[PDB]
Design a protein around this ligand. Structure first.
Ligand SMILES: *[C@@H]1O[C@H](CO)[C@@H](O)[C@H](O)[C@H]1NC(C)=O
Ligand SMILES: *[C@@H]1O[C@H](CO)[C@@H](O)[C@H](O)[C@H]1NC(C)=O
Ligand SMILES: *[C@@H]1O[C@H](CO)[C@@H](O)[C@H](O)[C@H]1NC(C)=O
Ligand SMILES: *[C@@H]1O[C@H](CO)[C@@H](O)[C@H](O)[C@H]1NC(C)=O
Length: 344
């Protein structure tokens, strides 16, 4: 079957099947200009047994790029432009087309917390203030909502959308945690006013949760309170990410990070998605146990490793980083095929 992705009890219902899912992150999929590269990458993800792919829904610039370069939105104080051209949201249109074709569903965030592909920084450059006043900067929010509408309206009736995502890892460094609560409440309500077919999620890392061991990620220094955010009515499921290497914690501490988040989700009556995770050292040994913890913990509805790597018909490889798991590699065997086999 096909149909819209929904929540059934505390699990996801994908194409009529209720149950745990595995997926992956492929931010770079959105920016592929050769259609054949999207298709081969998506054929590999689908043949691996993964059901969901996380792709950027943004590509923000302050200056128009060199002709032919991809850009989805140009942020300016004197009038912003949303690019619906061939070098614009038409590349995201094909990603959605290919997902429909390959039986995949997509998680699509609307703006980056980080300056990669512009992010909140690009809005700051156009509209003033800074990274934390962004959330309540009227001109910035007005353009952000116009972009939301430009993306959402394209795919609202597509069955390929798993969920709309407010942003990639939104933080408000040192802010009261209410700044994000209010912003998320308002934006998620707006998203729901545009599309009543699809799920909506925050896209936060999960920071701020008092049931843990007091390490920094559990503290409230980044303006987010996980339990508060996940109780927002217009958000259907929680998201949380995990990077011990960037956070100063060891790898095995990741198990408790999953468990606490899963409990918080279930306490709010909703599923959690373990949406990004990676380990730079020995990923097979350090990440396999996280996969098993998520698969075996009540309240977890699925997990998406950070990040797919693949290669194209012309010999070019995809964008990558130290976390990339290359299709068909040893780590693909360990972290993809063996995990997918275990879900069966
Ligand atoms: C951001 O702007 C607000 C309001 O001026 C200010 O209170 C806060 O200190 C600023 N942040 C930084 C990091 O300068
Ligand atoms: C598309 O989805 C909206 C709900 O978000 C619904 O109101 C509308 O009828 C659908 N469009 C078509 C053409 O079915
Ligand atoms: C890692 O961290 C926890 C404390 O968070 C500690 O109890 C455990 O012994 C440590 N494990 C390794 C392998 O370092
Ligand atoms: C992946 O691996 C199999 C060998 O297991 C091979 O048949 C196929 O060509 C490979 N696909 C790619 C993209 O290399």
């Amino acid at each position: 079957a096909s149909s819209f992705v929904t929540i059934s009890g505390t699990q996801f219902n994908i194409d009529g099947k209720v149950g745990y899912f595995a997926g992956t992150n492929c931010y770079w999929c959105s920016f592929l200009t050769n259609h054949a590269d999207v298709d081969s990458t998506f054929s590999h993800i689908s043949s691996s047994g993964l059901k969901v792919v996380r792709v950027w829904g943004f590509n923000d610039v302050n200056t128009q790029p060199s002709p032919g370069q991809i850009w989805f939105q140009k942020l300016s104080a004197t009038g912003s432009t949303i690019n619906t051209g061939a070098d614009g949201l038409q590349t995201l249109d094909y990603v959605v087309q290919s997902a429909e074709q390959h039986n995949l569903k997509l998680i699509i965030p609307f703006v980056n917390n980080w300056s990669d592909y512009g992010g909140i920084n690009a809005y700051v450059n156009a509209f003033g203030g800074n990274a934390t006043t962004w959330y309540t900067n009227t001109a910035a929010q007005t353009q952000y909502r116009k972009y939301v509408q430009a993306v959402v309206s394209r795919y609202a009736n597509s069955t390929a959308i798993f969920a709309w995502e407010l942003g990639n890892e939104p933080r408000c460094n040192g802010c009261s945690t209410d700044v994000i609560v209010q912003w998320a409440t308002s934006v998620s309500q707006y998203v729901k006013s545009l599309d009543s077919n699809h799920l909506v999620t925050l896209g936060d890392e999960g920071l701020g949760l008092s049931t843990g061991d007091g390490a920094y990620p559990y503290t409230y220094g980044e303006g987010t309170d996980f339990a508060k955010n996940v109780q927002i009515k217009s958000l259907d499921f929680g998201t949380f990410h995990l990077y011990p290497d960037s956070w100063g914690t060891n790898y095995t501490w990741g198990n408790g990070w999953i468990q606490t988040h899963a409990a918080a989700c279930l306490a709010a009556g909703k599923p959690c998605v373990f949406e990004e995770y990676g380990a730079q050292q020995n990923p097979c040994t350090n990440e396999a146990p996280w996969q098993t913890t998520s698969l075996t913990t009540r309240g977890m509805g699925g997990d998406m490793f950070w990040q797919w790597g693949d290669t194209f018909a012309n010999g070019a490889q995809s964008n990558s980083d130290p976390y990339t798991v290359w299709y068909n590699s040893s780590n693909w065997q360990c972290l993809v095929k063996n995990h997918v086999d275990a879900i069966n």
